[PDB]
Design an enzyme around this catalytic site. Structure first.
Site, PDB file in Angstrom:
ATOM      1  CE1 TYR A  87      -3.230   3.089   0.882  1.00 29.90           C
ATOM      2  CE2 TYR A  87      -1.751   3.245   2.784  1.00 29.90           C
ATOM      3  CZ  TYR A  87      -2.753   3.782   1.985  1.00 29.90           C
ATOM      4  OH  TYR A  87      -3.249   5.022   2.310  1.00 29.90           O
ATOM      5  CB  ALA A  88       1.526   3.588  -2.491  1.00 29.17           C
ATOM      6  CG  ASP A 131       1.683   1.213 -18.846  1.00 34.08           C
ATOM      7  OD1 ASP A 131       2.343   0.183 -18.639  1.00 34.08           O
ATOM      8  OD2 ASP A 131       0.515   1.346 -18.437  1.00 34.08           O
ATOM      9  CD  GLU A 135      -2.524   8.245 -15.583  1.00 34.99           C
ATOM     10  OE1 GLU A 135      -1.261   8.302 -15.705  1.00 34.99           O
ATOM     11  OE2 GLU A 135      -3.335   8.704 -16.447  1.00 34.99           O
ATOM     12  CG  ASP A 149      -0.531  -0.485 -14.008  1.00 31.46           C
ATOM     13  OD1 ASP A 149      -1.012  -0.814 -12.895  1.00 31.46           O
ATOM     14  OD2 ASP A 149      -1.248  -0.281 -15.026  1.00 31.46           O
TER      15      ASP A 149
HETATM   16  C1  LIG Z   1      -6.990   8.920  -5.033  1.00 28.87           C
HETATM   17  S1  LIG Z   1      -5.410   9.389  -4.771  1.00 28.87           S
HETATM   18  O1  LIG Z   1      -5.309  10.825  -4.644  1.00 28.87           O
HETATM   19  O2  LIG Z   1      -4.580   9.010  -5.891  1.00 28.87           O
HETATM   20  N1  LIG Z   1      -4.906   8.724  -3.391  1.00 28.87           N
HETATM   21  C2  LIG Z   1      -4.331   7.505  -3.281  1.00 28.87           C
HETATM   22  C3  LIG Z   1      -3.799   6.822  -4.383  1.00 28.87           C
HETATM   23  C4  LIG Z   1      -3.206   5.571  -4.221  1.00 28.87           C
HETATM   24  C5  LIG Z   1      -3.161   5.015  -2.954  1.00 28.87           C
HETATM   25  N2  LIG Z   1      -2.599   3.812  -2.686  1.00 28.87           N
HETATM   26  C6  LIG Z   1      -2.352   2.793  -3.532  1.00 28.87           C
HETATM   27  N3  LIG Z   1      -1.499   1.796  -3.169  1.00 28.87           N
HETATM   28  C7  LIG Z   1      -1.218   0.753  -3.969  1.00 28.87           C
HETATM   29  C8  LIG Z   1      -1.837   0.713  -5.207  1.00 28.87           C
HETATM   30  C9  LIG Z   1      -1.711  -0.271  -6.230  1.00 28.87           C
HETATM   31  N4  LIG Z   1      -2.526   0.194  -7.219  1.00 28.87           N
HETATM   32  N5  LIG Z   1      -3.115   1.396  -6.789  1.00 28.87           N
HETATM   33  C10 LIG Z   1      -4.033   2.025  -7.766  1.00 28.87           C
HETATM   34  C11 LIG Z   1      -5.304   2.483  -7.060  1.00 28.87           C
HETATM   35  C12 LIG Z   1      -6.434   2.708  -8.052  1.00 28.87           C
HETATM   36  C13 LIG Z   1      -6.434   4.133  -8.590  1.00 28.87           C
HETATM   37  C14 LIG Z   1      -5.231   4.359  -9.488  1.00 28.87           C
HETATM   38  C15 LIG Z   1      -3.990   4.483  -8.626  1.00 28.87           C
HETATM   39  C16 LIG Z   1      -3.252   3.153  -8.449  1.00 28.87           C
HETATM   40  C17 LIG Z   1      -2.701   1.726  -5.566  1.00 28.87           C
HETATM   41  N6  LIG Z   1      -2.958   2.754  -4.726  1.00 28.87           N
HETATM   42  C18 LIG Z   1      -3.695   5.741  -1.889  1.00 28.87           C
HETATM   43  N7  LIG Z   1      -4.257   6.946  -2.058  1.00 28.87           N
END
Ligand SMILES: CS(=O)(=O)Nc1ccc(Nc2ncc3cnn(C4CCCCCC4)c3n2)cn1
Length: 255
Positions: A87-88, A131, A135, A149
């Site tokens: 988780y990021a 890519d 995103e 990705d």
């Molecule tokens: C909405 S935001 O402003 O961008 N906040 C946000 C964005 C990402 C995360 N964490 C997170 N960790 C691991 C992954 C693996 N794939 N993703 C996909 C999530 C589906 C939307 C596209 C982005 C990548 C992940 N996202 C937490 N908060």
């Protein structure tokens, strides 16, 4: 490892579009926090991406830089595969960019540095991401950049980040991720990708004819790096450490 869904409580939604959704979620018994991609088996092979996903789990899981998002395990049931993902916390780079619309040069170079190492590592293990869209560039908690990705390949949606040789279709190699580094580098300081158009058809030309210009507020130091990376002839492109080595980078990064 034998994970079934009821081993998690699902948090808030994280996105996305294409394949289903990605969720915040928590391992019921260790209290672990993770991204749980939920992808309907329905629209998977109903689209032909399936086998080109297996050998992307393959690729995802045995890899291990700190600048690369880690994949833990997986599973499925009636419908949908489930990817159990690192988780990021600080979200994607796409959203940091919209938020701040451009980056300062200290921040950009760092993001580029972090990207090289994660790519330079990817390229030792002979792996090629295709890519490197923002995103797919998440952020750790220390704000470390983490590639993410799923279009990787062997050796040897928008085109904004693809290089000439791909878009038309030629014998390509790790020289693609370096054009994408150029496209990215530019996007970061300028805030828009160097080949943006309002159509797929312009963009193909803008890419084919390597057709970009620099706004004034962009330094001949960065002009030099971005100019260098985004050359047409793949062999023209710096190798990954000639990048890190670049004066302009080193003057501006973390370590
Ligand atoms: C909405 S935001 O402003 O961008 N906040 C946000 C964005 C990402 C995360 N964490 C997170 N960790 C691991 C992954 C693996 N794939 N993703 C996909 C999530 C589906 C939307 C596209 C982005 C990548 C992940 N996202 C937490 N908060």
């Amino acid at each position: 490892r034998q994970w079934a869904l009821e081993d998690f409580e699902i948090g808030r939604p994280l996105g996305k579009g294409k394949f289903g959704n990605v969720y915040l979620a928590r391992e019921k018994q260790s209290k672990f926090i993770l991204a749980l991609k939920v992808l309907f088996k329905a629209q998977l092979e109903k689209a032909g991406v399936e086998h080109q996903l297996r050998r992307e789990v393959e690729i995802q899981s045995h890899l291990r830089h700190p600048n690369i998002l880690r994949l833990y395990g997986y599973f499925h049931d009636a419908t949908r595969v489930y990817l159990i993902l690192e988780y990021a916390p600080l979200g994607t780079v796409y959203r940091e960019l919209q938020k701040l619309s451009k980056f300062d040069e200290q921040r950009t170079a760092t993001y580029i540095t972090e990207l090289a190492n994660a790519l330079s590592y990817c390229h030792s293990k002979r792996v090629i991401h295709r890519d490197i869209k923002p995103e797919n560039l998440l952020l750790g908690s220390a704000g470390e950049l983490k590639i993410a990705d799923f279009g990787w390949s062997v050796h040897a949606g928008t085109l904004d980040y693809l290089p000439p040789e791909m878009i038309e279709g030629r014998m390509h190699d790790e020289k693609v991720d370096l054009w994408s580094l150029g496209v990215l580098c530019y996007e970061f300081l300028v805030g828009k990708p160097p080949f943006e158009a309002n159509t797929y058809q312009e963009t193909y030309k803008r890419i084919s004819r390597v057709e970009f210009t620099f706004p004034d507020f962009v330094t001949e130091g960065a002009r030099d790096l971005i100019s260098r990376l985004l050359k047409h002839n793949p062999s023209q492109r710096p190798m990954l450490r000639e990048v890190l080595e670049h004066p302009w980078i080193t003057a501006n990064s973390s370590k």
